[PDB]
Amino acid sequence: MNSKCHCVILNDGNFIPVLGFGTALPLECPKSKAKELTKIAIDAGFHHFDSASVYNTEDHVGEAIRSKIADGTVRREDIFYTSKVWCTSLHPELVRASLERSLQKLQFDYVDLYLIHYPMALKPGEENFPVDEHGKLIFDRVDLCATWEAMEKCKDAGLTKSIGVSNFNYRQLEMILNKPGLKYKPVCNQVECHPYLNQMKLLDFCKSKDIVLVAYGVLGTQRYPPWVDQNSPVLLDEPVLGSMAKKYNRTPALIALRYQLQRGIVVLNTSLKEERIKENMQVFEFQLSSEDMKVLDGLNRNMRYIPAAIFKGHPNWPFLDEY
Numbered sequence: 001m002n003s004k005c006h007c008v009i010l011n012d013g014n015f016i017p018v019l020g021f022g023t024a025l026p027l028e029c030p031k032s033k034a035k036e037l038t039k040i041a042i043d044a045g046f047h048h049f050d051s052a053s054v055y056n057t058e059d060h061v062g063e064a065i066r067s068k069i070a071d072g073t074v075r076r077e078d079i080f081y082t083s084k085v086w087c088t089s090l091h092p093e094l095v096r097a098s099l100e101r102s103l104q105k106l107q108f109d110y111v112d113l114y115l116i117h118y119p120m121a122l123k124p125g126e127e128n129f130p131v132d133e134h135g136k137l138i139f140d141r142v143d144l145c146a147t148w149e150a151m152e153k154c155k156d157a158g159l160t161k162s163i164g165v166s167n168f169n170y171r172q173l174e175m176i177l178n179k180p181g182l183k184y185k186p187v188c189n190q191v192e193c194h195p196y197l198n199q200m201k202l203l204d205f206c207k208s209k210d211i212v213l214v215a216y217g218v219l220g221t222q223r224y225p226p227w228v229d230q231n232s233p234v235l236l237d238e239p240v241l242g243s244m245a246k247k248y249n250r251t252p253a254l255i256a257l258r259y260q261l262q263r264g265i266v267v268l269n270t271s272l273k274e275e276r277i278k279e280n281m282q283v284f285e286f287q288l289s290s291e292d293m294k295v296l297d298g299l300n301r302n303m304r305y306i307p308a309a310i311f312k313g314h315p316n317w318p319f320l321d322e323y
C-alpha cells in the first residue's frame with residue numbers, strides 16, 4: 001500500500017485506508033449486487049473494502065476487484081480487503097480452513113485483514129445460524145485465546161497481512177492482550193459507532209493499547225429487519241445533523257462521517273445509490289469545528305441498533321458489560 005493514501009498505521013506496521021466500503025447488502029438483494037456496487041465504489045475512489053465469510057458476497061467483490069485490476073484502474077497492493085471468521089469456525093482447527101475457503105472464493109493469495117467476527121461460538125457446520133426446534137441458536141464453547149493463536153499462524157503463513165477482532169468489549173480485548181505467549185496484538189476492534197452511540201470509553205481504551213477502532217452503523221445501519229428494531233429512530237433524521245449540514249453546506253450523512261474521522265476512527269459505509277457513493281468521498285473536503293464536535297458528542301444516548309439479540313443468552317455476549 002502507497003503510504004500516500006488517506007491512511008492510518010496499524011500496530012504491525014501496515015497501512016489502512018480510513019474510509020471503507022461495506023459489502024453486506026440489504027436482505028432483498030441478490031448477492032451479485034455486490035459486484036456492481038464494488039466497481040462503482042472503486043471508480044469513486046474507495047480502496048478499502050469490508051467483508052465477511054457470512055455476507056456471502058466475497059466471490060462477487062473479488063470479481064469486481066479483479067476486473068478493476070484487469071482494466072488498469074487499481075493494483076492488488078493498493079486495495080485493502082477485510083474478511084472475518086464466522087461464529088461457526090472459531091475452533092482453532094477450523095479458522096485456517098475458513099480463511100482458505102474465502103481466498104478460494106475471492107481468487108486472492110491473501111486478505112489484508114482477518115477478524116474474529118464475534119467473541120461467540122456456534123455449532124460447527126455449513127449453516128451459519130444453526131437453530132433448535134424452538135428457533136434458538138445452538139451455542140458452542142471455545143477458547144478465544146486458542147482461536148487467537150490460530151489467527152496468529154494465519155498471519156505467519158502469509159494468508160492475512162494483519163489480524164484483529166470485532167464486537168469485543170474491554171474485558172474480552174484484555175483476555176487477548178494478557179494472554180501468555182502472545183505474538184501479535186489485535187490491530188483493530190470493529191464495532192458499531194455513530195453520533196447516538198459514540199463509544200467514548202471503548203475508543204479511549206483501544207487507543208491506549210494501539211488498537212484502531214473501525215466503526216459500522218456510522219449512518220444508523222441498513223436497518224436489516226431481522227436485526228434492527230424497526231421502531232428505533234432513523235439516525236439521519238436527527239434534527240441536530242440536519243441543522244449542522246445546513247451550517248457547513250453539506251449533508252446529514254457527511255456530518256456523521258466526518259465526526260468519526262476527526263476522532264481517529266476508521267469509518268465504513270454502504271449505499272445502494274451511485275450518487276450517494278460519490279457524495280461520501282466528500283468527507284475529506286471539510287472540517288467540523290471543535291465546538292460542533294462537542295455538540296455532536298451531546299447526542300449520545302446509548303442507542304444500539306445492532307445488539308445481536310438472538311445471541312443474548314450466550315455466555316460471551318459482549319453487550320452486557322458497560323464497555
Ligand SMILES: NC(=O)c1ccc[n+]([C@@H]2O[C@H](COP(=O)([O-])OP(=O)(O)OC[C@H]3O[C@@H](n4cnc5c(N)ncnc54)[C@H](OP(=O)(O)O)[C@@H]3O)[C@@H](O)[C@H]2O)c1
Nearest residue numbers: 022023024216217218219220221222253269270271272276
Ligand atoms: N462487524 C459487524 O458486526 C458489522 C455489522 C453490520 C455491518 N457491518 C459492516 O458495515 C457496513 C456498513 O453497513 P451498515 O449496516 O452499518 O450501514 P451504514 O453504513 O450505517 O449505512 C446506513 C444507510 O445509510 C444510507 N446512506 C449511505 N450514504 C448516504 C447518503 N450520502 N445520504 C443518505 N443516506 C445514505 C444507506 O442507504 P441507501 O442504500 O438507500 O443509500 C444505508 O442503508 C456493512 O456493509 C458491513 O461491511 C459490520
Ligand SMILES: CC[C@H](c1ccc(O)cc1)[C@@H](CC)c1ccc(O)cc1
Nearest residue numbers: 023024025026027054055057224227
Ligand atoms: C452486516 C449485515 C449482516 C450482519 C452482519 C454482521 C452483523 O453483526 C449483523 C448483521 C446481515 C445478516 C447476514 C447481512 C445481510 C446481507 C448481507 O449481504 C450481509 C449481512
